[PDB]
């Protein structure tokens, strides 16, 4: 027979390779194809798909369907906060569980834009406008609505049209983030602050919601999969 | 009677070769690949087409 | 190949276009990108999106079930059985959920280990185990007894195996009566809807059976062996919302009601 | 403009005037099967515009208080004249389905739900170790409520909201096909849903392909004075339906 | 290929042709199908038949026997042996009779374990055994002892093998006195038809012999081999009505009288 | 000198290699393949022809 | 001589199988 | 190729050029040889600089770290666990602080070694160990029992290993965030420069696990697992002085003051 | 090295076979 | 597919194979070979060329 | 075996001062530390050659 030597990792079981092995049902029959709609290939055609974020995180309502409404109305002071939150996809409250961070939570690191969808959800004679910003770190949370200005920012007419939408650069000293949180990989700041009141007429509510839904941009990916710790047993289940 | 193939490589800085030892396509190795991407079915499932710079109503 | 998309440089804009307004309410995504809202630099982004493809974010070997026999015990009762089940397993089962619809090959490993239980015996020395391990399809003849002919297996496949070696491996072909296998199912086994309800009308998968072929020596012998599940050449179809309760059973999949997120103080508060 | 459309099926026309861009499946016209994707030898019956005409289901009433309602197709269906009398007469059948979801209101009104048809929405139980009954599941065209909190019964359904009957978030159900009435912005959305399965056909009476869940994420408000009254009405259309098995009615 | 024939539409008939009778008398079997009977529409059957081909049925390892062997016993008496006989196990046996006469190579593969004997001996601890497996064709010089000169084996084929290893492994080629190996024989070994009745009188296939090639060590060792026979490249022919009887004896057809099938409430019952 | 020829696939929707190391035919692995079926001579062992559409009889 | 590895199902008897010997 | 420069014959010289002279101040070496300052001959010199290229100099095994772990503990606590640091380690740290940036992929192999503990047990006599690598990134579940469902090991990649069989390897691709790894960092985590400050910022690679698979045994055991590293395809970047003083922590560069070299008698002495 | 797996009769000593050595 | 260079061997008195086997270029063995060298971006880092043979100031 | 199959790693990019050899450091030049007058070793004095 043909001389051979083993080399180090001989007879060793790795839970990720890849090596062809013998078939327990030779020329087996399988059953043949058929078009199901749907066919997933990659996982960002899910993380490209928007779900709602559950930024409403008070404690109290964190089992309600509460979670998903920004509240918002009639003002008597100008520049008032609306919302916000650090930008951490994969530890945040307030992004770790919408579909963005669920896949996120399969990987370590990530990179990429993304996409903040902003639905107005109040009566149609309601008007007003909010100025949706960026804050890159080196700087802390906006304090005021002058400080949140100065980054990326978009203002937010709302009008005929429902929706608008907030798209966060990539910004980063580094092609990959981590998606736990990190100190050297900070995210920077999303806020939100009123432009101007929300102005409605008499016997008109000027108490409504805003949704905000999340997703990813085209320019996206994720660099190795791990485990999620979302998940947990004792025993097997029965 | 191997296929020679590429192997995944860093970019903006190689073959390998690959022989089935079985009579049984479930013997062969996973097919792992770039493969291609489609998520329109998923992100933009409408009738009506939209264009990115227009209102999307009227 | 599977490069993400570039960014184009963009400069000022005055224009009537309204990238920046939608109707969400449509149930498509917008397809902004930063070259909408702000100037850009191009940026020739060289990333790939192999990770994320489906074939490899299932192909790995997960632990799916283990059990124990021993190498004496009453009547011939020496052996362990485990009907497939791919439920009973929280990570796996979780990755597995994602997608309503899948079909593939799967390829199994086995890793076997042994030890001693306590023992008044000296004179425990004893030669090298070897342990068999033997499928038995859905309505095939049942061991009852180590030492029963319905061991022989003519036809069943079976691995048998010496402690020392690699651990055993075996491919499985996919093996649906349908065209893809399903991880949900909307639906009851009876016309009559008197039967059970749920996934497990399908689970008709066939059952494991495992033992020693040594014979039995003076010193006792407990073995356990892990049973670990690789899809292959995986194609899916139809993905849903991840499980945010915890599993409670691998027959069904009734919940423990919970929240969608931890809290914070407030609205505005960085501290998540 | 692009608000107005008309559909027009057998011998039923449903026009809308303000209205969401029609979602299609995942990306999937429903049609017929073909040679090359069957299983059942037995020509196939074809009923046609028989069949594949508009029903309308019991319409339900949204409070500000509401948690939501939904309904399984093809139990909801098993009484609508010749589609119900097609399944009862066959073993195997198939069919698309187009969803009309229709709730209007004054501008004054505020709120707005989620549409959303999911397939194989099988429901956990509100006892963990039970089955949920069949009324808990389906009641035909009267839709089964959503609780807002946590409830209970030994064949009840685990039907707290927040997630949606089967252990996942609510706020995740964007993945499947659906759409948005949001009473600032429409009166109505529509969802056309091809055949999904395992299989090319299947039983109508032991499996449901799908269920259409209506969910408030923003609660109905309004001013004193203002319409109390604001119905729910959902209607819907199988298409291309075919059905083999001939036998016995069940 | 072996594809199974597909279905042809088939339209309303109304003609002298008459598919639906014919002559079970005759001999042979229907050829309606379908399309013949009932309205069809064309089927693109895709299916194969690779499973029911005659190779696939028998090509797996079955065990056909074991037996035993110590390393201790009296006046060298410390060897097993084994008459070559396939009719032995009740599964392999069964699925080789479907056939009158089959023609094909024989693969063999050998399973061999051990144990401890209860014991009061201190210091049991021991080299690995190494086995011998022997076979003698018909006539030839035969062990009466382990230390026998019978097993010089200058010539007869043989196999060493240490505990450890992968099972012993090994290729036998159609060895019949005519063109195919019988599964029934009607007849008689002698003229007068004074000597044995039935298949026995062809089976002079040799015998195994098997024995431990270490000396003996004051622990005692009981070891078990199990021999697998894997039947591969197999031409058959004449196929035959499977048995209903249980199997009583190796040596002939002898059955317990048995009948052919379960019974039940009615000829009108569905609960059989 | 090995031999290629293909694996068996599922239908509607690969090459291995066989290389034979020993010089006895009895060595070879299993002829597993599609063959060929005839069960005409176990179905229809008749002499005169019967035709599908016509009465057995006459 | 040449270098090679041994994968896990290494010194394995599987009754279901087509190996030369 | 990689050939040292050769020399060329030289005869006598009388010139104004000044090879002799320059000035260091410039920041650059003299370009002066031999031929420049003595009469010299012809020499063909053959030698080559292969051993002095990088990728020589750093693909070596090198042992990083290792640790211990049990067969017997206290409420499941019989697991080893390791950050990844190669810092811990004074050759190895050594080698690879000359390059301030460096670029590679990762060659691992581990050794695995065993030995018993002080027992007053008889009938320690027990079956080979089978042992558990598992590797767990930053932010993902972990072991906290040895039996604990974190060791499913869904996603995470392992290696599972019984002893007897060649040591396991593994090759881990290069990972870093940025382009390189740094060996040196002159900042801190944070913006204002509150959390710690160097290198031990960027260390964020995750965990190895360790367990023995085998269920325990009355025997006691303890297991030692040495991690060897050996970079590959290295490219690097900006040398460095290596460094005099003695390491003393993995997380920084804090050292003991220590003198350029050992002294002598005197400026002329020969004896050093 | 080149991934291998072993079959059943690896290092098996048979007194009638064909082998270079 | 294999590719074929040269081995090492001493100056002044061979061909050898290498075929990959892995998808991933992280697999392949160390890429040792006598490269090149520059080392004048550390030994004559200056703008300003000194010629060898000339004084360096003026 | 690679751990992670398919993986991507992150691009070059153009650091100036790639070293190939460690040649090209041993012909760059260092101060000699002459002076070992054994009480000027830990002094800068050891660099000096009076
Ligand atoms: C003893 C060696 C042979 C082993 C054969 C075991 C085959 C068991 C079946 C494995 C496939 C199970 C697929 C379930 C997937 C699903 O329904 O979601
Ligand atoms: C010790 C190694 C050599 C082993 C040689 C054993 C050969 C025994 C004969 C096997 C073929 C038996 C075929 C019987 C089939 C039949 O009659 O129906
Ligand atoms: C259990 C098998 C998988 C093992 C995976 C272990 C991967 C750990 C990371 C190794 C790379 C560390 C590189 C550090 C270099 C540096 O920063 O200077």
Redesign the interface.
């Known amino acids: 027979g043909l001389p051979t030597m083993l080399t180090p990792g ?4 790795l ?2 390779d890849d ?1 062809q ?5 030779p020329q ?1 029959d ?5 078009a ?15 779900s709602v974020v ?10 309600s369907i509460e ?2 409404q ?2 918002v109305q009639s003002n008597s002071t100008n520049g008032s ?1 609306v ?4 930008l ?1 996809p994969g ?4 992004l ?2 919408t ?1 963005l961070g ?1 896949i996120l939570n ?2 370590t690191h990530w ?3 993304i ?1 903040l ?1 902003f ?1 107005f959800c109040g009566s149609a004679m309601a008007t007003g406008k909010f100025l949706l910003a960026y804050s890159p770190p080196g700087a ?2 906006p304090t005021t609505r002058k400080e949140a200005m100065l980054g ?1 920012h ?1 203002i ?2 709302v009008g005929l ?7 966060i ?2 910004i980063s000293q580094t ?1 990959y983030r981590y998606v736990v949180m990190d100190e050297y990989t900070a995210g920077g ?1 999303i ?1 939100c602050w009123y432009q101007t009141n929300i102005v409605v007429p008499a016997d008109t509510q000027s108490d409504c919601k805003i ?1 905000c ?1 999340v ?1 990813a ?9 791990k ?2 710790p ?4 004792d025993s ?3 | 009677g191997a296929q020679v193939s590429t192997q ?1 490589t860093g ?2 800085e190689i073959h390998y070769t690959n022989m089935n030892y079985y009579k ?14 489609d998520p329109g079915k ?5 009738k009506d087409i ?1 264009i ?6 009227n | ?7 184009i440089s963009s400069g000022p804009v005055n224009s009537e ?18 070259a ?3 100037q ?1 630099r191009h940026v ?14 299932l ?5 799916v ?1 283990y059990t124990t026999y021993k190498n004496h015990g009453t009547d011939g009762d020496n052996f362990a059985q485990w009907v497939i089940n791919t ?9 597995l959920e994602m ?3 899948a ?1 593939f ?1 799967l ?1 199994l ?1 086995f ?1 076997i ?4 239980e ?13 342990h068999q391990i033997m ?1 038995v399809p859905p309505g095939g003849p049942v061991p009852t007894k180590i030492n029963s ?1 319905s ?41 009559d ?1 008197q039967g ?4 497990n009308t399908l689970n008709n998968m066939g059952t494991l059976y495992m033992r020693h ?7 006792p ?2 073995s ?1 062996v ?1 049973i ?1 599940f ?1 899809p ?2 995986v ?36 501290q ?1 | 403009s692009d608000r107005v459309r008309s559909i027009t099926l057998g011998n039923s026309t449903i026009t809308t005037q303000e209205c ?2 029609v ?1 299609v499946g ?1 990306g999937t016209w429903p049609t017929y099967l073909r040679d090359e994707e069957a299983t059942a030898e037995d020509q196939p019956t074809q009923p046609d515009v028989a069949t594949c005409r508009f029903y309308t289901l019991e319409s339900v009433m949204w409070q500000q208080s509401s948690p939501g309602w939904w309904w ?1 197709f093809p139990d909801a269906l098993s009484n609508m004249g010749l589609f119900g009398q097609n399944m009862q007469y066959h073993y195997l059948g198939r069919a698309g389905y187009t969803l009309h979801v229709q709730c209007n209101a004054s501008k004054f009104h505020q709120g707005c739900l989620l549409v959303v048809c999911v ?7 509100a ?6 009954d ?1 009324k808990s599941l389906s009641n035909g065209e009267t839709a089964n409520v959503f609780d807002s909190q ?1 409830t209970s019964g030994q064949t009840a359904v ?1 039907a ?1 909201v ?3 009957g ?8 964007t ?8 009473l600032r ?2 009166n109505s ?1 529509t ?1 056309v849903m091809p055949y ?4 090319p056909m299947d ?1 109508m ?5 799908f ?1 259409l869940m209506i969910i408030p994420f923003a609660p109905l408000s309004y001013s004193t004075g203002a319409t109390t009254y604001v119905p729910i009405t959902v209607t819907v259309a199988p298409m291309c339906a075919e059905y083999n098995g001939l036998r016995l009615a ?1």
């Open positions: 001989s007879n060793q079981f839970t990720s090596f092995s013998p078939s327990a049902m087996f399988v059953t043949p194809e058929m199901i709609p749907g066919q997933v290939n990659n996982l960002m055609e899910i993380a490209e798909v928007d559950p930024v409403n995180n008070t404690e109290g309502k964190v089992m979670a998903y920004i509240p906060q919302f916000g939150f650090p951490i530890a945040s409250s307030v770790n569980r579909l669920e399969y990987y990179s990429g834009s996409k969808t639905m802390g949370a990326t978009v937010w007419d049209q429902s929706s608008c939408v907030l798209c650069p990539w092609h700041y806020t949704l839904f997703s941009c085209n320019d996206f990916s994720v660099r190795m999969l485990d999620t979302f998940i947990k047993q097997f289940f029965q | 995944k970019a903006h049984d396509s479930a013997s062969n190795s996973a097919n792992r690949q770039e493969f291609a991407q998923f992100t933009e499932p409408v939209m990115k710079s227009m209102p999307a109503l | 190949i599977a490069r993400v998309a570039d960014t276009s309204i990238p920046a307004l939608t109707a969400a309410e449509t149930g498509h995504t917008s397809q902004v990108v930063p909408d809202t702000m850009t020739k982004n060289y990333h790939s999106r192999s990770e994320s493809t489906v074939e490899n974010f192909c790995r070997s997960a632990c079930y439920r009973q397993v929280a990570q796996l089962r979780r990755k997608f309503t619809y079909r090959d390829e490993t890793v280990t042994s030890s001693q306590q023992s008044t015996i000296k004179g425990q020395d004893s030669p090298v185990l070897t499928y002919y061991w022989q297996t003519s036809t069943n496949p079976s691995v048998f195996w010496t402690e020392g070696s690699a651990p055993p491996r075996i491919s499985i072909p996919f093996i649906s009566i349908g065209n893809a296998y399903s991880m949900f199912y909307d639906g009851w086994a009876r016309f809807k059970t309800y749920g996934i072929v040594n014979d039995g020596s003076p010193g012998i407990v356990t892990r670990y690789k292959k050449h194609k899916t179809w139809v993905p849903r919302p991840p499980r945010l309760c915890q599993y409670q059973k691998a027959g069904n999949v009734n919940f423990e009601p919970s929240g969608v997120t931890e809290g914070r103080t407030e609205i505005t508060a960085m998540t | 969401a861009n979602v995942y399984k397939p194989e929405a099988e429901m956990g139980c006892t963990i170790a039970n089955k949920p069949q946590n685990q707290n927040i997630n949606a089967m252990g996942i978030g609510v706020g995740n159900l993945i499947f096909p659906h759409q948005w009435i949001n912005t429409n959305a969802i999904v399965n395992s299989v039983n009476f032991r499996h449901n392909n269920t069940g």
